[PDB]
Amino acid sequence: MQYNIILLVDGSLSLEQANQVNEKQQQTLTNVEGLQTEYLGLKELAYPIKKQLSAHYYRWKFSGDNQSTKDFKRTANINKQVLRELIINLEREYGYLASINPKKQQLALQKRAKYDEIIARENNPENPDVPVTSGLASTQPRLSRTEKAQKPKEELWDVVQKMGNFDSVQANPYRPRFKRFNAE
């Protein structure tokens, strides 16, 4: 699998914390792939936990077997230098199969490009953008659909016998009943 930890180390000193993260990484993770690490920075987290107001956020994008979680999970709490820890297994988050499909990825790039074009005209440099068309409806249908529209699997069948067919056609419904008026 592909995991992603968001570790919460205390706010002591930068250089020594990075060492704490390397220590927390190299002890556990029995079997692992490449462990790329970043460093989002220093932020003042919202609610004070462990009586600390500053913390260093580390993100790990390693990958490995299911056993890589157990030892790390039971050791994080014991270590006084870690405030919280979340193992977000990204193979179960709300939407991953669509993200691996290549065709859906290119559409997202195209949607980004086209949407950026619309926002630009609206927030025009100084000239007034009269249409201000965004949330509103679009123009006539897309001719792309009209043509590339699917065709039902038209199973082709061949006639073998016949009898009595004459296609008379009696499509004259709700016709007039009365015909010509008369006097007794």
Partner 1 sequence: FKRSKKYCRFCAIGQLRIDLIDDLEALKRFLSPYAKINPRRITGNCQMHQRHVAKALKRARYLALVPFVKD
Partner 2 sequence: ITTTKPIKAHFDPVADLLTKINNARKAKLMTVTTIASKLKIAILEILVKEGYLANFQVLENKSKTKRIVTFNLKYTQRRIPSINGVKQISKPGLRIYRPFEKLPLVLNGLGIAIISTSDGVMTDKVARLKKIGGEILAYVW
Partner 3 sequence: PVVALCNTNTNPELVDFIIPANNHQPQSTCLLMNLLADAVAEAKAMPTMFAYKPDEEIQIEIPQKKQITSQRLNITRNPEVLTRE
Residue 162 makes contact with partner 2 by CB under 8 A: yes
Residues with Cβ within 8 Å of 63's Cβ and at least 6 positions away in sequence, in order, are 1, 2, 3, 32, 33, 34
**Which is closer to partner 2, CB of 92 or CB of 162?**
162
What sign does the dihedral 21-23-26-29 (CA atoms) show? negative
Nearest-approach distance from CB 180 to RNA, in angstroms: 32
Residues with Cβ within 8 Å of 83's Cβ and at least 6 positions away in sequence, in order, are 8, 9, 10, 49, 50, 52, 55
Residue 24 parent element (H or E): helix 14-27
Nearest-approach distance from CB 98 to partner 1, in angstroms: 6
Residues with Cβ within 8 Å of 73's Cβ and at least 6 positions away in sequence, in order, are 85, 87
Residue 178 makes contact with partner 3 by CB under 8 A: yes
**Which is closer to partner 2, CB of 157 or CB of 181?**
157
Which positions lie near RNA, rule CB under 7 A? 1, 47, 49, 66, 69, 73, 77, 84, 86-89, 92-95, 97-98, 100-101, 103-104, 107, 110-111, 114-115, 118, 133-138, 141-142, 144-145, 148-150, 153
Which positions lie near partner 3, rule CB under 8 A? 174, 176-178
Which positions lie near partner 2, rule CB under 8 A? 152, 154-166, 168, 170, 172-173, 175
